[PDB]
């Protein structure tokens, strides 16, 4: 399920992260997401708490958007992009077919349309419609040829770690925080 935020629930602006830091865990590699919320009104707190209760009762995952990485540097319909099959390692080659505008930058997020792993772009070079995107970590799969690139709206597939650890009498709740980790399976 989707972690509620001001984009799924604009009526709860307090669900916008006040601080987020992306943690690199290398024992395979996975991202840690530490979220700290601003002062939450009671309705916002109860809705967040009830959604996390739903998450626990369903055994589902928590999909998380980090808007601080949504730069929309690459635009266009990606379903006509071609990712040749058989690729693995730290670089992925795409053929844009001239259907994408703008270019990605090192530090942007990246994922494949068929797999939930999120990567960081570490380097970008191009030759015409050939894009050479270096990734971190290495690809978790070998491309089949049907994958499509995802630059915008990237969701992290996570699980909640500290389900209990962390009333400011403005009526609100202060110091609320969530510890999340990208889940392997
Ligand atoms: Cl091609
Ligand atoms: Cl190249
Ligand atoms: Tb703020
Ligand atoms: Tb503040
Ligand atoms: Tb391998």
From Swiss-Prot:
One of its GO terms (cellular component) is virus tail, baseplate. It is found in: Virion. Gene3D superfamilies: 2.40.30.290, 3.30.200.190. Pfam families: DTP-pb9_A-dom_C (PF21424), DTP-pb9_A-dom_N (PF21425), DTP-pb9_B-dom (PF21430). Keywords: Late protein, Viral tail protein, Virion. It comes from the Viruses. InterPro entries: DTP-pb9_A-dom_C, DTP-pb9_A-dom_N, DTP-pb9_B-dom. Homohexamer. Interacts with baseplate tube protein p140 and baseplate hub protein pb3. Possesses OB-fold domains probably serving host adhesion properties. Forms the simplified baseplate, together with the p132 collar protein, the baseplate tube protein p140 and baseplate hub protein pb3. This is Distal tail protein pb9. The gene is D16.
């Amino acid at each position: 399920m989707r972690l509620p935020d001001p984009y799924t629930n604009p009526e709860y602006p307090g669900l916008g992260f006040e601080s987020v830091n992306l943690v690199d865990n290398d024992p395979a590699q996975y991202w840690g997401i530490n979220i700290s919320y601003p002062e939450l009104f009671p309705d916002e707190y109860a809705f967040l708490d009830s959604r996390l209760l739903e998450y626990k009762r369903t055994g589902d995952y928590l999909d998380v958007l980090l808007p601080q990485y949504e730069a929309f540097r690459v635009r266009g319909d990606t379903k006509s992009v071609t990712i040749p099959a058989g690729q693995k390692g730290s670089q992925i080659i795409l053929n844009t077919n001239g259907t994408l505008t703008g270019q990605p930058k090192a530090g942007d997020l990246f994922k494949l349309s068929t797999h939930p792993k999120v990567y960081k772009i570490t380097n970008f070079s191009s030759s015409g419609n050939v894009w050479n995107i270096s990734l971190y970590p290495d690809l978790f799969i070998t491309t089949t040829g049907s994958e499509k690139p995802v630059f915008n709206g990237i969701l992290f597939r996570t699980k909640l770690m500290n389900g209990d650890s962390f009333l400011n009498n403005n009526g609100t709740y202060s110091g609320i925080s969530l510890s999340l980790r990208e889940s392997l399976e």
